[PDB]
Write a protein that binds this ligand. Sequence first.
Ligand SMILES: [NH3+]c1ncnc2c1ncn2[C@@H]1O[C@@H]2CO[P@@](=O)(S)O[C@H]3[C@@H](F)[C@H](n4cnc5c([NH3+])ncnc54)O[C@@H]3CO[P@@](=O)(S)O[C@H]2[C@H]1F
Lengths: 170, 170
Amino acid sequence: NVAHGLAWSYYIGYLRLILPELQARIRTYNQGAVSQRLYILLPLDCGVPDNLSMADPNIRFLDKLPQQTGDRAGIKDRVYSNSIYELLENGQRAGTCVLEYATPLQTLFAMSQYSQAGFSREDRLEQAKLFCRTLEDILADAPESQNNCRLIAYQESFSLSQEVLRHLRQ
Amino acid sequence: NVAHGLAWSYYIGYLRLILPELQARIRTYNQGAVSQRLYILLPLDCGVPDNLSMADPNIRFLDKLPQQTGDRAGIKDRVYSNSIYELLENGQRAGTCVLEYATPLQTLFAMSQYSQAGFSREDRLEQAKLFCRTLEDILADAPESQNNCRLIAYQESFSLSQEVLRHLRQ
Ligand SMILES: [NH3+]c1ncnc2c1ncn2[C@@H]1O[C@@H]2CO[P@@](=O)(S)O[C@H]3[C@@H](F)[C@H](n4cnc5c([NH3+])ncnc54)O[C@@H]3CO[P@@](=O)(S)O[C@H]2[C@H]1F
């Protein structure tokens, strides 16, 4: 239903555009090294806090990648930026990677709360699971995703940093 | 159907966020003046060229507004930028305004071409008309839209610059 559209919008408007020019931006920042893949958190509870340092203290913002720009729909130099986070484990730099949330989930949440949107608060977990399934099916035959993307879906004590680290070691 | 989701995504992810901080960015650039409203082109043929200077030569890029940033879904300083265009009429500066296309239309087009998206090329005109209707209904009770937004839907000789100018003089 609704999630299907957002997942294609999330691919045609973002992933399809920044994933090709992604390793260049990492190989540029590198010159502890950063990992070559964009890690997309996919909480099925649709809990997307803007500050990534609140879901887990062991997730530390480090720096930004070099910006990417592109004229898009009449906006000269529309710019895509991505935050580099390092993940701690017992006070130890255990990883470093470009980590971010899948914004469309935050939209599904913020969309349900509105009355005029006709979107129930109970469907939030199904649309999330439909957003991940539709997204992973897209990336499954995505030439833009030439092994440079890692989807991290999860539900909920819990350690998000351990969840990202687990996918890092692979 | 699909367009309904994109229109709420287009409001919760963009309009709801930049429209409040919009007049400040204009009143800042001003200090020929720029108009206080964001003008959103809504072509029902879903023809959204990235370079706005191609649909009409009398639409001239002028400058960018001051950027807006906000931590969004774990991206430190995600930045929203908006291009200032001036519109010519018989080689005469006839207007100046922050003019842009509604990117989700460009998505509906680029979404139809994919086979895995299950979106026909014939539904493109209905989903466009559903995107405008759903969007204008949102802005109709949008406190964020305190008379600072102007929707410009149109179909197709034709002069886009005349179409924007017509809404400017009101
Ligand atoms: N500056 C700028 N200019 C014009 N339009 C903008 C815009 N900022 C938001 N919008 C409008 O909002 C729609 C939905 O926005 P939202 O955020 S809820 O979801 C996005 C997001 F998930 C992802 N995305 C793209 N850039 C990203 C960056 N920097 N960081 C993280 N995510 C990114 O792509 C989805 C769809 O993007 P669209 O462009 S197809 O439609 C977008 C677009 F119409």
